[PDB]
Amino acid sequence: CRHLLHLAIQRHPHFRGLFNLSIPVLLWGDLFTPALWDRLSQHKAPYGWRGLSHQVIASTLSLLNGSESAKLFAPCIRCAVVGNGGILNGSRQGPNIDAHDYVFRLNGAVIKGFERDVGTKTSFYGFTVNTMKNSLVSYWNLGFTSVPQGQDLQYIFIPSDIRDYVMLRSAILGVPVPEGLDKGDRPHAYFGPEASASKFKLLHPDFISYLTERFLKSKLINTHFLYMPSTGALMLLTALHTCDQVSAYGFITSNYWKFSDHYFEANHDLSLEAALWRDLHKAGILQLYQR
Ligand SMILES: *[C@@H]1O[C@H](CO)[C@@H](O)[C@H](O)[C@H]1NC(C)=O
Ligand SMILES: *[C@@H]1O[C@H](CO)[C@@H](O)[C@H](O)[C@H]1NC(C)=O
Where does ligand 1 bind, in terms of residues with CB under 6 Å?
20, 22-23
The Cα–Cα gap between 246 and 263 comes to 21
The Cα–Cα gap between 120 and 66 comes to 30
Residues in the annotated binding site for CMP-N-acetyl-beta-neuraminate: 84, 107, 230, 262
Residue 170 burial (CB count, 10 A): 24
Q: In sequence order, what are the beta bridge partners of 124?
A: 104, 154
Q: From which experimental method does this structure derive?
A: X-ray
The Cα–Cα gap between 234 and 228 comes to 9
Where does ligand 2 bind, in terms of residues with CB under 6 Å?
89-90
Ligand nearest to the CA of 209: 1
The Cα–Cα gap between 214 and 228 comes to 13
For ligand 2, the distance from its centroid to the CA atom of residue 90, given in whole angstroms, is 7
Contact present, 118 and 97 (Cβ < 8 Å): yes
Q: In sequence order, what are the beta bridge partners of 200?
A: 155
| Beta strands in the chain, from DSSP E residues, in sequence order | 78-82, 102-106, 124-127, 154-157, 200-202, 245-249, 287-288
Residue 271 burial (CB count, 10 A): 12
Is the sign of the CA dihedral 94, 273, 155, 287 positive or negative? positive
Q: Write phi, then psi, for 78 (nearest 5 degrees).
A: -100, 125
Contact present, 106 and 130 (Cβ < 8 Å): no
For 26, 47, 181, the CA distances from 50, given in Å and listed in that order, are: 19, 9, 18
Q: Whose CA is nearest to atom 1 of ligand 2?
A: 89
Give the three-class secondary structure for 179. Answer: coil
The Cα–Cα gap between 151 and 257 comes to 37
Residues in the annotated binding site: 84, 107, 230, 262
**Resolution, angstroms, 1 dp:** 3.1
Contact present, 131 and 107 (Cβ < 8 Å): yes
Is the sign of the CA dihedral 113, 117, 118, 119 positive or negative? positive
Maximum CA pair distance of the chain? 52
Contact present, 155 and 198 (Cβ < 8 Å): no
